[PDB]
Amino acid sequence: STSLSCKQCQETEITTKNEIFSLSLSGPMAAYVNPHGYVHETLTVYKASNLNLIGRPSTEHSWFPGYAWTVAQCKICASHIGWKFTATKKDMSPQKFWGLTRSALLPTI
Numbered sequence: 001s002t003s004l005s006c007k008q009c010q011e012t013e014i015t016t017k018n019e020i021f022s023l024s025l026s027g028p029m030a031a032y033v034n035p036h037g038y039v040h041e042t043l044t045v046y047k048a049s050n051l052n053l054i055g056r057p058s059t060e061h062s063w064f065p066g067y068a069w070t071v072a073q074c075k076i077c078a079s080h081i082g083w084k085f086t087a088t089k090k091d092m093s094p095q096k097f098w099g100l101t102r103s104a105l106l107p108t109i
């Protein structure tokens with residue numbers, strides 16, 4: 001229903017609350033530890049748009065075993081919004097989703 005927009009440029013829709021989903025047995029809203037020990041608050045959604053991808057998928061320090069990650073940035077302002085996760089194996093489900101930085105969106109949830 002509600003849009004989630006890039007907090008930096010404000011006008012740009014990234015996804016909607018009805019794309020919010022739970023992977024495996026995790027809640028949709030979760031915090032994970034980055035390689036330097038920062039606690040990073042994310043939201044998992046099936047679909048997102050107005051994002052560029054940077055770099056190639058990587059499984060290093062993957063918060064989601066089985067999935068690789070690729071940095072995702074706002075197409076308009078280049079602010080880092082989150083990551084695209086893609087499955088490393090063909091029988092996994094889903095094959096793709098997005099883990100977005102909560103604090104990079106508006107409204108903030």
Ligand SMILES: O=C1CC[C@H](N2Cc3c(ccc4c3OCC43CCNCC3)C2=O)C(=O)N1
Pocket residue numbers: 033034035040060061062063064069083
């Ligand atoms: O599944 C997920 C999504 C990506 C998320 N990452 C990945 C990552 C984050 C921060 C810094 C870095 C990084 O890899 C590259 C690096 C570490 C080596 N030095 C350069 C910068 C970060 O937060 C993570 O740990 N897990």
Ligand SMILES: [Zn+2]
Pocket residue numbers: 006007008009010012074075076077078079
């Ligand atoms: Zn933006």
